A paper describes a structure:
The reported structures are of a SaBphP2 PCM in the wild-type (wt) and mutant forms determined at 1.65 Å and 2.2 Å, respectively. The wild-type protein crystallized in the dark in the Pr state in space group P21. Crystals grown from the PCM constructs diffracted to 1.65 Å resolution at 100 K and 2.1 Å at 293 K. Given the high resolution of SaBphP2 wild-type structure, we clearly observe an intricate network of waters and conserved amino acids which stabilize the BV-chromophore in the Pr state. 2(c) and 3(d)]. Interestingly, not a single amino acid from the PHY domain forms direct contact with the BV chromophore. Crystal structures of the wild-type classical SaBphP2 determined at the highest resolution of any PCM to date reveal an intricate network of hydrogen bonds between conserved amino acids, neighboring water molecules, and BV which all stabilize the Pr state. In the SaBphP2 PCM crystals, subunits A and B form a noncrystallographic dimer.
PHYs are composed of a photosensory core module (PCM) and an effector, enzymatic domain. In bacteriophytochromes (BphPs), the PCM consists of three domains named PAS (Per ARNT Sim), GAF (cGMP phosphodiesterase/adenylyl cyclase/FhIA), and PHY (phytochrome-specific GAF-related) [Fig. 1(a)].1–5 The effector domain is typically a histidine kinase, covalently linked to a PHY domain, although other nonenzymatic output domains can be found.
Author numbering: 9 to 489
The structure:
Amino acid sequence: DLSQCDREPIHLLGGIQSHGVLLAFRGPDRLLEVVSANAQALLGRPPETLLGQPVGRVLPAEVLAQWEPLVARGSVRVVLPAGAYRALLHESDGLTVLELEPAELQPGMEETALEVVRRLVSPLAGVKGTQALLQTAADTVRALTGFDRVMVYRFDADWHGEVLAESKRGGMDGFLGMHFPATDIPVQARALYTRNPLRLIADARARPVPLLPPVVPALGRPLDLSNSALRSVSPVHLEYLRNMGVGASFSLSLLKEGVLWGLIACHHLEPLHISHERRRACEVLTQLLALQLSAEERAAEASEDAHRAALLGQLATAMGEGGTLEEVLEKESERVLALTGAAGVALLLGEEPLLVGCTPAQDEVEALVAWLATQPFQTSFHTDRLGTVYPPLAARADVAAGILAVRLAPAAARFAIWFRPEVARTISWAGNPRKPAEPEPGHQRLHPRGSFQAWEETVRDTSLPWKRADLGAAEGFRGAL
Ligand SMILES: *C/C=C1/C(=C/C2=NC(=C\c3[nH]c(/C=C4\NC(=O)C(C=C)=C4C)c(C)c3CCC(=O)O)/C(CCC(=O)O)=C2C)NC(=O)[C@H]1C
């Protein structure tokens, strides 16, 4: 893809985090084929002397005693000499991958998790605005994880993102309202996070534990750790966290109607391990947030649609109550503009344009019509940045940053064209987005930026986006004209 940031194969880095152990077994005899270099931590023996051995001769008696439920369920609690561990199974590269990580220590964890689930599934939760929904999600995730800072991060259209809501302990700094470059979470990371919706970095300073051997022998490349809970993350990102002053990180993908909408990101100033089952409990909260957002967004759409139908009905009542069509539209200007949330409208009903509200002058409208008549757009054309595709009005963002035009005839140049002014947006970037990384000379290593301090810019010449209800209202108004 675009940048070198996009090319690092983060699922093939060949390392795991030091708090866990990984063992990959092959074939009917379950012969050990890949093992983490720290595996004496739970095997009692030097791991390289166990490659090739069958599983019953490798694993502790305690784990073997749980093999049946492990195989059947893919996840069991095992009590080892080192303490309680969560054992996890998944498949990768034709191997059965066993991961062990420290298990949840609080017996009441799930009871606590059900309580915070209540806050987010409540009778009419999200009734103070979706902002209160986002805040509740940040608060409950922080309560359940104990992380110092929890942020709701939304991806915008160009895949840069912004923090919409933040929950943090007293005294902490935060990132509320700040924007971050798309390269902060590159394309292959976004792809992985769409398929694997949870990731924990327990200690941003710890060194990775390598796998032995360093390739899957049948493949000649490292074991695919795409679905591994212990996967050590990109070194560049660990440097990013260090530059942020973050010692531990945990994030959850927000998947809303199938697409990666954002993340809930958690930061801790010191190392912090969250158990597998506590992370899965937090995943319920994030799934609930996504459901609540969808329910409220669709509710808003349905309400907006009803308002547009009502406007069309009120205009039909106004019509035929006397006067020509032109007289009615002039008198009902406010309703005609509200159909599409516009500031002005031009009607070309056969002669010169009828200009209602704030529009460009007659000359500029007539020139725009002659251009629209050449364009390919079936029945409706819309843009929120007219100046990029129609230079004659590019300096006129005071009245025509956005347009929504509908055809009123097959071949003839008869249109209704609604206009919108620009909405300037002053945004704070977390660091200078003109320097989103610090590459070494030669451009072969790359480091993250050193500074996340606010850097201000104002986005101009773009209107509010045209909503689905705006487009439907315009289609429905065509029949009246
Ligand atoms: C040239 C490449 C760069 C780069 C690579 C990179 N970042 C990755 C993971 C990642 N980044 C973020 C970003 C944020 N964390 C926050 O708190 C905020 C806003 C407040 C942002 C924008 C996150 C959340 C993550 C996921 C991991 C986590 O900590 O939760 C990855 C993938 C790491 C992996 O192996 O999974 C890569 C490759 N970051 C850059 O800045 C440039 C230099």
